Amino acid sequence: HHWGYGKHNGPEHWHKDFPIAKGERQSPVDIDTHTAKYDPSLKPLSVSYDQATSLRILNNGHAFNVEFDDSQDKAVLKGGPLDGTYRLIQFHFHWGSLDGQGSEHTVDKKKYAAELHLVHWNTKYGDFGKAVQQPDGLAVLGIFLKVGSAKPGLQKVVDVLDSIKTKGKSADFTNFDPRGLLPESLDYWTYPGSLTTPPLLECVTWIVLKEPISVSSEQVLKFRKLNFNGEGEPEELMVDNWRPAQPLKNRQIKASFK
Numbered sequence: 001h002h003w004g005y006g007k008h009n010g011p012e013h014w015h016k017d018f019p020i021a022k023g024e025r026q027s028p029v030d031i032d033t034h035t036a037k038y039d040p041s042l043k044p045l046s047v048s049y050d051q052a053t054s055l056r057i058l059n060n061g062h063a064f065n066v067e068f069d070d071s072q073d074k075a076v077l078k079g080g081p082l083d084g085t086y087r088l089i090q091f092h093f094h095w096g097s098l099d100g101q102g103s104e105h106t107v108d109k110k111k112y113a114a115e116l117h118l119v120h121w122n123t124k125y126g127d128f129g130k131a132v133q134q135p136d137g138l139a140v141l142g143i144f145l146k147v148g149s150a151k152p153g154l155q156k157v158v159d160v161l162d163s164i165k166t167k168g169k170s171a172d173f174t175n176f177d178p179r180g181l182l183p184e185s186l187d188y189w190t191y192p193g194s195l196t197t198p199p200l201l202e203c204v205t206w207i208v209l210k211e212p213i214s215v216s217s218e219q220v221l222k223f224r225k226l227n228f229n230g231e232g233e234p235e236e237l238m239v240d241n242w243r244p245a246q247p248l249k250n251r252q253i254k255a256s257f258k
Ligand SMILES: O=C(O)/C=C/c1ccc(Cl)cc1Cl
Pocket: 092, 117, 119, 132, 195, 196, 197, 198, 199
């Protein structure tokens, strides 16, 4: 497959190789704050990242992933809408060419500069590849980035980006603490959806935090200096690696807060 984010291989094209692109529970979506309903039955969200073991950062030609050791219950997400225990496997971002776009989810059609996805898989399915074949296989914690003050806990990420400029480059990335990427509040919206890149599988419980984090214009500028291309290929800046909002169809977005 040769999918991407350009005119010729971008989201409008994806359905030909990945027909579930036009399915019933695709992501992202617009979150209409006046239609999402507070759900008193939602349990409290539990982000348990104290024992997280980061390993490596990889430019995969679509984003950069910070990868974790998920061979045991070291960094897990539980509670909220979730039954059981979801292990952190990786995080990555989606961002724009300009500060007015980049997020995949929108809020009342508002686009943020970027969006962080912390990807977890349901440990009842044993491995990640099995989990993505299940409707409750993944939980993705989504966090909006707005441009403002620098996020100190992001700076170790931006400083390593010079070493993974092009597709297929990786760097050691141990001892990174993903707690430094969270906002203060864990108030969230939740709905059932999908991966937002091919293969677009309908396996995700989305948990999108209401409170965005602020990053500096310098920090996001360094994201936009990455490359989609491999080394020694013509330079294509890694920008606008976001899928736009998809039809809500027969789904309700629930709020954890009033
Ligand atoms: O950008 C994303 O949100 C998609 C990430 C992703 C992409 C492919 C597969 Cl199999 C699994 C995952 Cl979690």
